[PDB]
Amino acid sequence: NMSTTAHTEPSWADLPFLDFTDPNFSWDSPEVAEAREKSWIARTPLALLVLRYAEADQLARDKRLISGFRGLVDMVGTPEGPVRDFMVDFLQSLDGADHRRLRGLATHPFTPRRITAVQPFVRSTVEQLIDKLPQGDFDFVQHFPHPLPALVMCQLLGFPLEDYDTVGRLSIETNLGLALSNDQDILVKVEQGLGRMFDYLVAAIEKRKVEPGDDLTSDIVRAFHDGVLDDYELRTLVATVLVAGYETTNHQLALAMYDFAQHPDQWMKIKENPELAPQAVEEVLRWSPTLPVTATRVAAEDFEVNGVRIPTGTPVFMCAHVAHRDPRVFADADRFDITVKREAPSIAFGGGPHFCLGTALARLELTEAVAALATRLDPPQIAGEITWRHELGVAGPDALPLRFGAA
Ligand code: HEM
Ligand SMILES: COc1ccc([C@](O)(c2cncnc2)C2CC2)cc1
Ligand SMILES: [Cl-]
Ligand SMILES: [Cl-]
Numbered sequence: 001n002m003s004t005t006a007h008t009e010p011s012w013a014d015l016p017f018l019d020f021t022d023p024n025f026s027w028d029s030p031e032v033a034e035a036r037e038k039s040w041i042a043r044t045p046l047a048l049l050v051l052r053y054a055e056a057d058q059l060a061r062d063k064r065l066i067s068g069f070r071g072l073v074d075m076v077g078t079p080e081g082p083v084r085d086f087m088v089d090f091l092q093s094l095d096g097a098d099h100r101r102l103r104g105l106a107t108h109p110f111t112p113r114r115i116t117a118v119q120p121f122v123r124s125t126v127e128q129l130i131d132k133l134p135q136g137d138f139d140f141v142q143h144f145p146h147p148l149p150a151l152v153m154c155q156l157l158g159f160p161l162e163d164y165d166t167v168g169r170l171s172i173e174t175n176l177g178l179a180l181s182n183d184q185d186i187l188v189k190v191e192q193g194l195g196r197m198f199d200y201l202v203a204a205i206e207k208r209k210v211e212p213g214d215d216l217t218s219d220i221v222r223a224f225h226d227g228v229l230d231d232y233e234l235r236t237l238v239a240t241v242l243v244a245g246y247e248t249t250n251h252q253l254a255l256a257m258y259d260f261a262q263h264p265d266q267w268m269k270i271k272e273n274p275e276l277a278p279q280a281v282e283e284v285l286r287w288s289p290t291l292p293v294t295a296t297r298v299a300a301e302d303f304e305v306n307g308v309r310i311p312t313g314t315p316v317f318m319c320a321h322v323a324h325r326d327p328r329v330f331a332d333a334d335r336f337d338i339t340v341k342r343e344a345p346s347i348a349f350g351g352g353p354h355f356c357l358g359t360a361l362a363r364l365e366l367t368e369a370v371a372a373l374a375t376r377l378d379p380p381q382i383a384g385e386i387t388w389r390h391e392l393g394v395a396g397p398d399a400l401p402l403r404f405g406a407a
């Protein structure tokens with residue numbers, strides 16, 4: 001598909017080739033930096049890959065580039081079932097009128113007022129998790145970046161807080177990163193992963209249809225009562241928020257510690273001036289985004305951008321990780337430095353109408369965590385095997401063993 005298109009497009013002839021599906025591929029490879037230097041966009045086996053900051057934002061907003069997933073499902077050849085249904089009907093797959101309708105129902109808790117309102121819960125959750133941290137070598141994931149976003153997710157969606165372990169486990173086991181797989185045995189455990197999480201969600205939704213609260217599930221239920229969306233759209237929307245809201249926030253917090261394990265001097269600088277936390281979080285998002293590939297799109301028509309023809313059906317992926325090290329935008333881009341007040345933000349949350357719904361909540365959880373950890377604890381250092389997810393498009397430890405302080 002990408003190979004047949006390449007043989008038909010003269011504007012693709014000088015584009016560098018990057019095989020990110022390869023098991024030994026690194027985003028920090030000198031091959032990748034060369035490709036960005038040579039071209040704003042690269043050829044991959046699955047998609048065109050945008051490597052520069054300016055164009056990554058441009059194309060993430062371009063109306064001629066439809067929001068991905070529907071195109072990737074047909075090309076792979078996913079059979080009809082619970083997996084395909086979710087991958088074609090969930091928020092990231094929709095565009096136009098249906099997208100604005102369904103997204104608008106889940107936008108209220110992410111307004112600047114509601115982020116302020118939920119902030120005390122986030123702060124006290126962080127505080128409590130630090131209080132009960134082990135003194136020696138421990139998995140940072142198990143003891144902090146798993147419980148934190150899980151508890152916040154339970155608070156947001158109106159689940160009992162005691163279910164944070166179950167809720168987080170139900171979010172991981174869905175395995176959306178392996179939903180576009182060609183294998184059947186893989187697609188079966190994705191089907192069963194979704195089913196089990198939907199079993200929890202359906203119970204919580206019908207509970208809200210009789211006794212609603214101040215939570216997000218209650219608000220989407222109000223829209224169901226008003227006939228804005230049906231029952232299928234209800235549980236799909238609540239599922240999307242949940243799955244998206246846990247795993248990447250988890251991984252991002254782990255990546256934050258991994259970064260400061262390499263730069264303990266900068267950790268101490270946050271300890272001195274805790275106000276550096278938001279700037280530090282932005283540097284973590286720039287240097288090590290949990291999603292190195294952010295916005296995924298498919299061309300809905302033949303069009304041209306910056307000298308490159310993009311035919312209908314061509315997948316285009318925005319490579320935020322590489323765009324974050326663009327020297328056209330970032331000074332000393334290949335160095336982790338939290339002390340630099342940067343004009344341009346990270347683009348870790350995509351762009352366009354599909355931009356991360358939980359952007360502000362994600363930044364809140366990251367800031368509250370980094371501020372409190374750096375104030376209260378000594379710099380982290382790695383204490384064993386980091387189990388990186390060998391999954392295409394996602395960066396993050398499944399387990400991060402560490403200690404805070406040498407002694
Ligand atoms: C730091 C952790 C996070 C990162 C790096 C991240 C990143 C992203 C990215 C790159 C997208 C795609 C944007 C695009 O297509 O242009 C996205 C979409 C989305 N995110 Fe996140 N996200 C994070 C946390 C969260 C949280 C905490 C929530 C909910 C509380 C959330 C909910 C969503 C939803 C619902 C979408 C689909 C938006 C749509 O298609 O309308 N995410 N996220
Ligand atoms: C690698 O390109 C991707 C893949 C998956 C997503 C996703 O929407 C997400 C959103 N927010 C936080 N984490 C994950 C997954 C729920 C479907 C986004 C971009
Ligand atoms: Cl460059
Ligand atoms: Cl150039």
Ligand SMILES: [Cl-]
Nearest residue numbers: 330331342343
């Ligand atoms: Cl800068």
